[PDB]
Structure 1
Amino acid sequence: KEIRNLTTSEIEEQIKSSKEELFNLRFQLATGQLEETARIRTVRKTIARLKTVARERE
């Protein structure tokens, strides 16, 4: 999605979005503390884009 960043920044980004944001929101939506639930489907799709462009670079 026009991320156009250094591939190591792509790996830092997949590793940040991959657990931290998404895993935290998955715990919050279970223990009854997350509203703005639509964050989740945002982060998921972000973790797809960072992966696809890295695969395009190969």
Structure 2
Amino acid sequence: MKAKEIRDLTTSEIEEQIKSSKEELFNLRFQLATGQLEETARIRTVRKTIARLKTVAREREIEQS
């Protein structure tokens, strides 16, 4: 998810999105070990989204202070 879309999400929405995205990553990691994952590039995309989600959230907290 691009930062612009993430910026639209409310703090609560971001928090929930991070959790859901983290779960997706865990599933992907388990699939890869079992050899069930073909789309390897998916893993990277999820990671950067979670990083973005975290970045946008951090900006808000700094802004509040």
TM over 0.5: yes
Gaps of 5+ in 2: none
Taking structure 2 as the reference length, what is the TM-score of the superposition?
0.69
Residue by residue, what CA displacement relative to the aligned partner does 1:19-55 show, whole Å, maximum 9, x if unpaired? 3110000000000100011000000000000001111
More displaced stretch, 8-17 vs 27-36 = 8-17
Alpha-carbon distance in structure 1 between the residues aligned to 2:22 and 2:6: 20
Q: Which runs of 5+ in 1 are unaligned?
A: none
RMSD: 2.2
- Percent of matched pairs sharing the same residue: 97
Q: Which has the larger radius of gyration?
A: 2
How many residues matched? 58
Query: What corresponds to 1:18 in structure 2?
Result: 21
